[PDB]
Design a protein around this ligand. Structure first.
Ligand SMILES: [Zn+2]
Lengths: 30, 74, 232, 226
């Protein structure tokens, strides 16, 4: 999943309603 | 450099990489080459045998700048 | 005729590689005939020759690689024709040269001393006992370190010897008398958990935890790390 | 001070280590990369080049015989390269490596040789994965980076066994067709790109009698652009 990416400096790196998010993810809503 | 050129020539002759022109007469050439290599060995051996048979500051100075390309320090 | 058996320059080679001053502290100066000074001088000459210059560079980097081991590596090439006196004379030089910073010198000295121990076991044994029981702490420590260098270069004697050896220069094989049990009684070794050199979300987390526990339970200091990490 | 040897050009002390220490250092780097690729990513290029340097050298002059010495720092370095590129291949190490500028001009050759006999990820298979990663990428590297990518690919080609039959030429040919379809819309205008010609020359040497036959047409279009 994590993918190599050339950063802004030019070096390598490994990179792969907030309350409403809880409301939808909450099993009580289901 | 002379010594190393001769050394690499003897090495190539050892590998079978004889000079291209050589590669019955060639057998005689190889035999004579071995005899002459032994002649070289004998001469160099009897020469090396003859050759074998504040001061600290200058000793360190001499040792620390033994640049062979810069003669008069070797 | 018979040039390959009586080489006149064998003894002068021993005299050359035996006439260094191994007793030097290498502090603030070196003795004029100190062996480390000689090795540094040879390395400087090799660099000068390299800077002088095709195939010559290949010869320099593949068969010279230094100039100091030229005597020892010569005598190793003439081991079948060396007399016992020559072995006895070359033994102290090869012994002293085992602790060289230069790897080629150390390897050649180890090969030469192993050949000496193959040919003159009594003198080698006496020297080893004198060094191991020596009155100086430094001498005993150096004896153990030299033993370790011999152990390392144990496998690098036949390549340095001759392109057609081991048919001549017979070395007595280890004479095993008894036989091990027909099936080996225990496990030959415990495999190391998750070796770095072997190429291969609750499930991922538990797998990571299992791998971490296995690595923590496996002892890496108890395996040959470099031997197992080399390809075949 | 201890009497040591200096490099007359820079004044630094010359240092030499034995195989038991070089192999230990290689294994230490291997463990570090294995158990933490994210931390090793910034330092990955330098580590790979430094260990490929050891892989390139030969412990003994006997290049005819395989270096079967148990220590064999060269073999340890080869194992390091093989394991690193097998592990990080799914993470796109190949497009990232071939895009980046490589200081060690011999690292691509050492990578090709050390992965040549690898059965899990052959050098040919490594080339195929590099091509697949470049092709599947949403945006190909920019005009400046694409030149470096082509040069690195060509250098990798030079060290590949391009005459060796394998079950990949009918696949590498299609990958290269699709990868060359995009170059005219990527490469810069007035920059020398002989690396593409070197790649074409290497490709036209494959033993397949039919892969190059199909590859010839995108070759013609890219040559027209060039
Ligand atoms: Zn000294």
């Amino acid at each position: 999943t994590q993918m190599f990416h050339e950063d802004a400096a030019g070096g390598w790196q490994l990179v792969a309603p907030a309350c409403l998010q809880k409301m939808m993810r909450s099993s009580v809503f289901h | 450099a002379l010594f190393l050129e001769c050394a690499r020539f003897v090495h190539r002759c050892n590998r079978g990489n004889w000079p291209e022109w050589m590669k019955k007469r060639n057998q005689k050439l190889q035999w004579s080459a071995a005899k002459l290599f032994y002649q070289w060995g004998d001469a160099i051996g009897i020469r090396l045998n003859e050759l074998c048979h504040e001061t600290k500051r200058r000793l360190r100075k001499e040792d620390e700048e033994e640049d062979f390309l810069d003669d008069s320090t070797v | 005729e018979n040039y390959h058996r009586n080489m006149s320059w064998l003894h002068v080679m021993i005299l050359l590689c035996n006439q260094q001053s191994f007793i030097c502290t290498h502090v603030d100066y070196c003795h004029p005939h100190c062996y480390l000074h000689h090795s540094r001088s040879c390395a400087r000459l090799v660099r000068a020759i390299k800077l002088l210059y095709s195939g010559m560079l290949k010869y320099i980097r593949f068969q010279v690689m230094s100039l100091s081991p030229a005597p020892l590596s010569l005598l190793i090439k003439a081991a079948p024709i060396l007399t016992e006196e020559m072995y006895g004379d070359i033994q102290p030089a090869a012994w002293e040269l085992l602790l060289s910073m230069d790897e080629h010198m150390a390897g050649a000295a180890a090969a030469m001393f192993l050949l000496c121990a193959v040919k003159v076991p009594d003198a080698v044994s006496d020297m080893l006992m004198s060094e191991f029981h020596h009155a100086e702490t430094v001498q005993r420590l150096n004896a153990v370190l030299k033993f370790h260098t011999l152990w390392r270069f144990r496998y690098q004697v036949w390549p340095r010897m001759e392109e057609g050896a081991q048919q001549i220069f017979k070395i007595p094989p280890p004479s095993i008398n008894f036989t091990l049990p027909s099936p080996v009684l225990g496990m030959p070794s415990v495999p190391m958990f998750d070796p770095p050199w072997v190429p291969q979300l609750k499930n991922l987390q538990q797998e990571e935890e299992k791998k971490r526990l296995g690595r923590e339970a496996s002892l890496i200091t108890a395996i040959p790390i470099t031997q197992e990490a080399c390809y075949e | 001070t201890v009497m040591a040897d200096k490099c007359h050009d820079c004044g630094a002390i010359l240092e030499e280590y034995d195989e038991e220490t070089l192999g230990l250092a290689i294994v230490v780097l291997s463990t570090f990369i294995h158990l933490s690729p994210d931390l090793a990513a910034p330092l990955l290029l330098d580590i790979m080049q430094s260990v490929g340097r050891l892989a390139s050298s030969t412990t003994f002059s006997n290049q005819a015989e395989s270096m079967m010495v148990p220590g064999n720092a060269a073999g340890v370095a080869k194992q390091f390269l093989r394991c690193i590129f097998h592990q990080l291949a799914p993470n796109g190490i190949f497009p990232q490596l071939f895009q980046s500028a490589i200081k060690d001009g011999t690292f691509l050759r050492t990578l090709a040789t050390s992965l040549m006999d690898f059965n899990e990820l052959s050098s040919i298979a490594a080339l195929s994965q590099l091509l697949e990663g470049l092709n599947n990428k949403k945006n190909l590297p920019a005009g400046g980076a694409m030149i470096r990518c082509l040069e690195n690919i060509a250098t990798f080609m030079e060290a590949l066994p391009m005459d060796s039959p394998s079950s990949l030429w009918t696949t590498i040919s299609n990958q290269f067709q699709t990868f060359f379809a995009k170059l005219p819309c990527v490469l810069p205008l007035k920059c020398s790109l002989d690396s593409s010609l070197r790649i074409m020359i290497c490709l036209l040497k494959i033993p397949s009698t039919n892969a190059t036959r199909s590859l010839l047409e995108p070759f013609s279009k890219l040559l027209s652009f060039v």
